[PDB]
């Protein structure tokens, strides 16, 4: 789940 | 501990018609991430549990959002892209049943009870803090946060609408309809993906992943 992880980390 | 003011702030911070609806859904997933980040104590959960909660509840959250948005209109839905889907358009595209279900069980009832943005945000926070989500590292913490959300919601209801003793329960009793409608919409989305004649953007497609 690339996109969700990236958005949650930022 | 779970103030309704911050939840309302989260709501106000984020401000073939089937193709337009899918575009709007992909656009609003990005926005949903930010919304959830603004809900108290959500960012403090383990990242994996944040992923689990959002992946379990995204469809219901977005459905609630646009259903409340479409209060101002009759026989139609307002997409976040600034586009209106009329009941007749949906019916003429072959998705009239689920569209009528949305208008009847969600939009018209929200309008009938004048559900405000604070209550919408609290219901969406309850949906977000879904302790039944499979794979949660600690479903007890999620359950506790859910309890705090609806405690604050009941307090807000009894303070703002003291003349409606049944308003809290009436708000909670729209969640079964939201669950059913979300499941049906997910079925439609998977059918569109399998058929593959409808453009699905990357974030929506990732939500469709296993
Ligand atoms: C049309 C076939 C059903 C279907 C729907 C139902 C749409 C209909 C109004 C009942 C979908 C809804 C979901 C899960 C999210 C939508 C988010 C939006 C649109 C947000 C916004 O605009 O703020 C996904 C695509 C397929």
């Amino acid at each position: 789940h690339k996109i969700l992880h990236r958005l949650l980390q930022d | 501990d779970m103030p309704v003011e911050r939840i309302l702030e989260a709501e106000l911070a984020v401000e073939d018609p089937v193709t337009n609806i899918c575009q709007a859904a992909d656009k609003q997933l990005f926005t949903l991430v930010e919304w959830a980040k603004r809900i108290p104590h959500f960012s403090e959960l383990p990242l994996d549990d944040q992923v689990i909660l959002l992946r379990a509840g995204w469809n219901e959250l977005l459905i609630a959002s646009f259903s409340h948005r479409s209060i101002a209109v009759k026989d139609g839905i307002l997409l976040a892209t600034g586009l209106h889907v009329h009941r007749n358009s949906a019916h003429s595209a072959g998705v009239g049943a689920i569209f009528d279900r949305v208008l009847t069980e969600l939009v018209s009832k929200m309008r009938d009870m004048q559900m405000d943005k604070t209550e919408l945000g609290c219901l969406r926070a309850i949906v977000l803090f879904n302790p039944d989500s499979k794979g949660l590292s600690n479903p007890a913490e999620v359950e506790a946060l859910r309890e705090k959300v609806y405690a604050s919601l009941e307090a807000y209801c009894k303070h703002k609408y003291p003349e409606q003793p049944g308003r809290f329960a009436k708000l909670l009793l729209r969640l079964p309809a939201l669950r059913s409608i979300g499941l049906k919409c997910l079925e439609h989305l998977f059918f569109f993906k399998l058929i593959g004649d409808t453009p699905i953007d990357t974030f929506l497609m990732e939500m469709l992943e296993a």
Side-chain angles (χ1 to χ4, degrees), chain B residues 21 59 61-71 77-80 102 106-107 110 181 185:
Chain B
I21 292 172
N59 52 316
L61 295 167
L62 299 184
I63 288 167
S65 273
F66 68 73
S67 292
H68 191 270
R69 191 186 304 123
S70 310
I71 285 318
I77 291 295
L78 304 190
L79 310 181
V102 167
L106 292 184
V107 173
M110 279 159 149
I181 284 171
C185 295

PDB file of all heavy atoms in Angstrom, chain B residues 21 59 61-71 77-80 102 106-107 110 181 185:
ATOM      1  N   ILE B  21     -17.624  10.090 -10.830  1.00  0.00           N
ATOM      2  CA  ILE B  21     -17.672   9.678  -9.431  1.00  0.00           C
ATOM      3  C   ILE B  21     -16.358   9.028  -9.013  1.00  0.00           C
ATOM      4  O   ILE B  21     -15.851   9.274  -7.912  1.00  0.00           O
ATOM      5  CB  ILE B  21     -18.871   8.742  -9.200  1.00  0.00           C
ATOM      6  CG1 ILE B  21     -20.179   9.522  -9.347  1.00  0.00           C
ATOM      7  CG2 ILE B  21     -18.779   8.075  -7.830  1.00  0.00           C
ATOM      8  CD1 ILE B  21     -21.409   8.652  -9.317  1.00  0.00           C
ATOM      9  N   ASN B  59     -14.468   3.968   2.302  1.00  0.00           N
ATOM     10  CA  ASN B  59     -15.675   4.091   1.493  1.00  0.00           C
ATOM     11  C   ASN B  59     -16.817   4.690   2.300  1.00  0.00           C
ATOM     12  O   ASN B  59     -17.503   5.601   1.823  1.00  0.00           O
ATOM     13  CB  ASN B  59     -16.072   2.737   0.897  1.00  0.00           C
ATOM     14  CG  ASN B  59     -16.158   1.628   1.933  1.00  0.00           C
ATOM     15  OD1 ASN B  59     -15.292   1.493   2.796  1.00  0.00           O
ATOM     16  ND2 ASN B  59     -17.204   0.813   1.836  1.00  0.00           N
ATOM     17  N   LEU B  61     -16.498   6.596   4.964  1.00  0.00           N
ATOM     18  CA  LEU B  61     -16.168   7.988   5.273  1.00  0.00           C
ATOM     19  C   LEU B  61     -16.513   8.907   4.104  1.00  0.00           C
ATOM     20  O   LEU B  61     -17.192   9.929   4.282  1.00  0.00           O
ATOM     21  CB  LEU B  61     -14.687   8.112   5.653  1.00  0.00           C
ATOM     22  CG  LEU B  61     -14.330   7.365   6.945  1.00  0.00           C
ATOM     23  CD1 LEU B  61     -12.819   7.234   7.148  1.00  0.00           C
ATOM     24  CD2 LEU B  61     -14.991   8.014   8.156  1.00  0.00           C
ATOM     25  N   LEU B  62     -16.080   8.545   2.894  1.00  0.00           N
ATOM     26  CA  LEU B  62     -16.364   9.374   1.723  1.00  0.00           C
ATOM     27  C   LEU B  62     -17.854   9.432   1.409  1.00  0.00           C
ATOM     28  O   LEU B  62     -18.363  10.484   0.992  1.00  0.00           O
ATOM     29  CB  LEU B  62     -15.606   8.851   0.505  1.00  0.00           C
ATOM     30  CG  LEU B  62     -14.087   8.849   0.627  1.00  0.00           C
ATOM     31  CD1 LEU B  62     -13.433   8.403  -0.674  1.00  0.00           C
ATOM     32  CD2 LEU B  62     -13.600  10.227   1.039  1.00  0.00           C
ATOM     33  N   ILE B  63     -18.562   8.310   1.572  1.00  0.00           N
ATOM     34  CA  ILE B  63     -20.002   8.307   1.333  1.00  0.00           C
ATOM     35  C   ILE B  63     -20.695   9.268   2.285  1.00  0.00           C
ATOM     36  O   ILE B  63     -21.538  10.070   1.870  1.00  0.00           O
ATOM     37  CB  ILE B  63     -20.568   6.880   1.450  1.00  0.00           C
ATOM     38  CG1 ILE B  63     -20.123   6.042   0.254  1.00  0.00           C
ATOM     39  CG2 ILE B  63     -22.083   6.916   1.536  1.00  0.00           C
ATOM     40  CD1 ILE B  63     -20.360   4.570   0.430  1.00  0.00           C
ATOM     41  N   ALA B  64     -20.347   9.209   3.573  1.00  0.00           N
ATOM     42  CA  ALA B  64     -20.907  10.153   4.536  1.00  0.00           C
ATOM     43  C   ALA B  64     -20.612  11.586   4.128  1.00  0.00           C
ATOM     44  O   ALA B  64     -21.494  12.451   4.176  1.00  0.00           O
ATOM     45  CB  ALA B  64     -20.345   9.885   5.932  1.00  0.00           C
ATOM     46  N   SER B  65     -19.368  11.853   3.729  1.00  0.00           N
ATOM     47  CA  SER B  65     -18.981  13.210   3.356  1.00  0.00           C
ATOM     48  C   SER B  65     -19.863  13.744   2.235  1.00  0.00           C
ATOM     49  O   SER B  65     -20.520  14.781   2.395  1.00  0.00           O
ATOM     50  CB  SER B  65     -17.502  13.255   2.950  1.00  0.00           C
ATOM     51  OG  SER B  65     -16.665  13.448   4.077  1.00  0.00           O
ATOM     52  N   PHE B  66     -19.908  13.053   1.093  1.00  0.00           N
ATOM     53  CA  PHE B  66     -20.686  13.641   0.004  1.00  0.00           C
ATOM     54  C   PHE B  66     -22.190  13.575   0.261  1.00  0.00           C
ATOM     55  O   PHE B  66     -22.923  14.447  -0.223  1.00  0.00           O
ATOM     56  CB  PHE B  66     -20.319  13.033  -1.362  1.00  0.00           C
ATOM     57  CG  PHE B  66     -20.711  11.591  -1.561  1.00  0.00           C
ATOM     58  CD1 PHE B  66     -22.035  11.216  -1.748  1.00  0.00           C
ATOM     59  CD2 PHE B  66     -19.731  10.623  -1.670  1.00  0.00           C
ATOM     60  CE1 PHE B  66     -22.371   9.888  -1.973  1.00  0.00           C
ATOM     61  CE2 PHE B  66     -20.056   9.303  -1.902  1.00  0.00           C
ATOM     62  CZ  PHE B  66     -21.376   8.931  -2.051  1.00  0.00           C
ATOM     63  N   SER B  67     -22.670  12.599   1.037  1.00  0.00           N
ATOM     64  CA  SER B  67     -24.088  12.572   1.378  1.00  0.00           C
ATOM     65  C   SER B  67     -24.476  13.804   2.183  1.00  0.00           C
ATOM     66  O   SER B  67     -25.521  14.415   1.931  1.00  0.00           O
ATOM     67  CB  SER B  67     -24.430  11.296   2.152  1.00  0.00           C
ATOM     68  OG  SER B  67     -24.310  10.146   1.334  1.00  0.00           O
ATOM     69  N   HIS B  68     -23.648  14.187   3.159  1.00  0.00           N
ATOM     70  CA  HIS B  68     -23.936  15.410   3.901  1.00  0.00           C
ATOM     71  C   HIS B  68     -23.780  16.635   3.011  1.00  0.00           C
ATOM     72  O   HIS B  68     -24.541  17.600   3.140  1.00  0.00           O
ATOM     73  CB  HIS B  68     -23.037  15.526   5.134  1.00  0.00           C
ATOM     74  CG  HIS B  68     -23.459  16.608   6.082  1.00  0.00           C
ATOM     75  ND1 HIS B  68     -22.996  17.903   5.991  1.00  0.00           N
ATOM     76  CD2 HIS B  68     -24.316  16.588   7.131  1.00  0.00           C
ATOM     77  CE1 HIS B  68     -23.544  18.633   6.947  1.00  0.00           C
ATOM     78  NE2 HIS B  68     -24.349  17.859   7.652  1.00  0.00           N
ATOM     79  N   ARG B  69     -22.805  16.611   2.099  1.00  0.00           N
ATOM     80  CA  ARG B  69     -22.615  17.745   1.199  1.00  0.00           C
ATOM     81  C   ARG B  69     -23.853  17.982   0.342  1.00  0.00           C
ATOM     82  O   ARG B  69     -24.220  19.131   0.070  1.00  0.00           O
ATOM     83  CB  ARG B  69     -21.385  17.518   0.317  1.00  0.00           C
ATOM     84  CG  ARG B  69     -20.942  18.746  -0.470  1.00  0.00           C
ATOM     85  CD  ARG B  69     -19.806  18.428  -1.440  1.00  0.00           C
ATOM     86  NE  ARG B  69     -18.652  17.822  -0.784  1.00  0.00           N
ATOM     87  CZ  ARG B  69     -18.136  16.645  -1.113  1.00  0.00           C
ATOM     88  NH1 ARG B  69     -18.637  15.924  -2.103  1.00  0.00           N
ATOM     89  NH2 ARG B  69     -17.086  16.185  -0.437  1.00  0.00           N
ATOM     90  N   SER B  70     -24.517  16.907  -0.081  1.00  0.00           N
ATOM     91  CA  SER B  70     -25.656  17.017  -0.985  1.00  0.00           C
ATOM     92  C   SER B  70     -26.969  17.363  -0.273  1.00  0.00           C
ATOM     93  O   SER B  70     -28.041  17.151  -0.856  1.00  0.00           O
ATOM     94  CB  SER B  70     -25.819  15.719  -1.780  1.00  0.00           C
ATOM     95  OG  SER B  70     -24.592  15.323  -2.372  1.00  0.00           O
ATOM     96  N   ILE B  71     -26.917  17.887   0.956  1.00  0.00           N
ATOM     97  CA  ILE B  71     -28.136  18.330   1.630  1.00  0.00           C
ATOM     98  C   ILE B  71     -28.789  19.467   0.858  1.00  0.00           C
ATOM     99  O   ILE B  71     -30.016  19.515   0.708  1.00  0.00           O
ATOM    100  CB  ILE B  71     -27.832  18.745   3.082  1.00  0.00           C
ATOM    101  CG1 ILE B  71     -27.606  17.511   3.951  1.00  0.00           C
ATOM    102  CG2 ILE B  71     -28.960  19.600   3.650  1.00  0.00           C
ATOM    103  CD1 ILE B  71     -28.577  16.405   3.666  1.00  0.00           C
ATOM    104  N   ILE B  77     -26.484  14.446  -6.259  1.00  0.00           N
ATOM    105  CA  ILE B  77     -25.301  14.361  -5.411  1.00  0.00           C
ATOM    106  C   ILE B  77     -24.285  15.389  -5.886  1.00  0.00           C
ATOM    107  O   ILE B  77     -24.072  15.557  -7.093  1.00  0.00           O
ATOM    108  CB  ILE B  77     -24.689  12.943  -5.420  1.00  0.00           C
ATOM    109  CG1 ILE B  77     -25.611  11.960  -4.700  1.00  0.00           C
ATOM    110  CG2 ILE B  77     -23.320  12.936  -4.762  1.00  0.00           C
ATOM    111  CD1 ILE B  77     -25.762  12.246  -3.220  1.00  0.00           C
ATOM    112  N   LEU B  78     -23.660  16.077  -4.933  1.00  0.00           N
ATOM    113  CA  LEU B  78     -22.596  17.030  -5.217  1.00  0.00           C
ATOM    114  C   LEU B  78     -21.247  16.353  -4.999  1.00  0.00           C
ATOM    115  O   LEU B  78     -20.911  15.988  -3.868  1.00  0.00           O
ATOM    116  CB  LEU B  78     -22.724  18.267  -4.329  1.00  0.00           C
ATOM    117  CG  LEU B  78     -24.062  19.004  -4.391  1.00  0.00           C
ATOM    118  CD1 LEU B  78     -23.969  20.333  -3.659  1.00  0.00           C
ATOM    119  CD2 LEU B  78     -24.495  19.212  -5.835  1.00  0.00           C
ATOM    120  N   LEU B  79     -20.485  16.176  -6.078  1.00  0.00           N
ATOM    121  CA  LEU B  79     -19.132  15.652  -5.998  1.00  0.00           C
ATOM    122  C   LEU B  79     -18.166  16.750  -5.573  1.00  0.00           C
ATOM    123  O   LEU B  79     -18.393  17.938  -5.820  1.00  0.00           O
ATOM    124  CB  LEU B  79     -18.694  15.085  -7.349  1.00  0.00           C
ATOM    125  CG  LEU B  79     -19.635  14.104  -8.050  1.00  0.00           C
ATOM    126  CD1 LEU B  79     -19.020  13.623  -9.359  1.00  0.00           C
ATOM    127  CD2 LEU B  79     -19.943  12.935  -7.135  1.00  0.00           C
ATOM    128  N   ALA B  80     -17.063  16.336  -4.944  1.00  0.00           N
ATOM    129  CA  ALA B  80     -16.067  17.295  -4.477  1.00  0.00           C
ATOM    130  C   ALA B  80     -15.359  18.014  -5.619  1.00  0.00           C
ATOM    131  O   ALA B  80     -14.712  19.040  -5.382  1.00  0.00           O
ATOM    132  CB  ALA B  80     -15.034  16.599  -3.595  1.00  0.00           C
ATOM    133  N   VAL B 102     -28.742   5.863  -1.693  1.00  0.00           N
ATOM    134  CA  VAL B 102     -27.992   6.948  -1.061  1.00  0.00           C
ATOM    135  C   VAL B 102     -28.902   8.141  -0.789  1.00  0.00           C
ATOM    136  O   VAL B 102     -28.888   8.720   0.304  1.00  0.00           O
ATOM    137  CB  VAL B 102     -26.784   7.345  -1.927  1.00  0.00           C
ATOM    138  CG1 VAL B 102     -26.202   8.658  -1.444  1.00  0.00           C
ATOM    139  CG2 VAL B 102     -25.731   6.256  -1.873  1.00  0.00           C
ATOM    140  N   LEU B 106     -29.659   8.108   3.323  1.00  0.00           N
ATOM    141  CA  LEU B 106     -28.601   8.950   3.874  1.00  0.00           C
ATOM    142  C   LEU B 106     -28.880  10.432   3.688  1.00  0.00           C
ATOM    143  O   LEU B 106     -28.993  11.160   4.680  1.00  0.00           O
ATOM    144  CB  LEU B 106     -27.252   8.571   3.247  1.00  0.00           C
ATOM    145  CG  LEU B 106     -26.723   7.187   3.624  1.00  0.00           C
ATOM    146  CD1 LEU B 106     -25.346   6.955   3.027  1.00  0.00           C
ATOM    147  CD2 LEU B 106     -26.687   7.020   5.135  1.00  0.00           C
ATOM    148  N   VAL B 107     -28.989  10.911   2.447  1.00  0.00           N
ATOM    149  CA  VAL B 107     -29.096  12.348   2.209  1.00  0.00           C
ATOM    150  C   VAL B 107     -30.396  12.898   2.785  1.00  0.00           C
ATOM    151  O   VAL B 107     -30.392  13.889   3.525  1.00  0.00           O
ATOM    152  CB  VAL B 107     -28.979  12.659   0.707  1.00  0.00           C
ATOM    153  CG1 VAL B 107     -29.267  14.131   0.449  1.00  0.00           C
ATOM    154  CG2 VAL B 107     -27.597  12.284   0.195  1.00  0.00           C
ATOM    155  N   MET B 110     -30.385  12.880   6.693  1.00  0.00           N
ATOM    156  CA  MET B 110     -29.529  13.982   7.126  1.00  0.00           C
ATOM    157  C   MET B 110     -30.236  15.324   6.986  1.00  0.00           C
ATOM    158  O   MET B 110     -30.122  16.189   7.863  1.00  0.00           O
ATOM    159  CB  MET B 110     -28.229  13.999   6.315  1.00  0.00           C
ATOM    160  CG  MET B 110     -27.158  13.020   6.758  1.00  0.00           C
ATOM    161  SD  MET B 110     -25.966  12.671   5.442  1.00  0.00           S
ATOM    162  CE  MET B 110     -24.475  12.369   6.388  1.00  0.00           C
ATOM    163  N   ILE B 181     -24.635   0.434   2.515  1.00  0.00           N
ATOM    164  CA  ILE B 181     -24.436   1.171   1.272  1.00  0.00           C
ATOM    165  C   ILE B 181     -22.966   1.155   0.868  1.00  0.00           C
ATOM    166  O   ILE B 181     -22.638   1.046  -0.322  1.00  0.00           O
ATOM    167  CB  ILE B 181     -24.989   2.601   1.421  1.00  0.00           C
ATOM    168  CG1 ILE B 181     -26.518   2.572   1.329  1.00  0.00           C
ATOM    169  CG2 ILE B 181     -24.389   3.536   0.376  1.00  0.00           C
ATOM    170  CD1 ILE B 181     -27.186   3.880   1.683  1.00  0.00           C
ATOM    171  N   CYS B 185     -21.520  -0.274  -2.674  1.00  0.00           N
ATOM    172  CA  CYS B 185     -20.691   0.552  -3.545  1.00  0.00           C
ATOM    173  C   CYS B 185     -19.348  -0.106  -3.832  1.00  0.00           C
ATOM    174  O   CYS B 185     -18.848  -0.032  -4.962  1.00  0.00           O
ATOM    175  CB  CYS B 185     -20.482   1.927  -2.915  1.00  0.00           C
ATOM    176  SG  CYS B 185     -21.997   2.894  -2.747  1.00  0.00           S
TER     177      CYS B 185
END
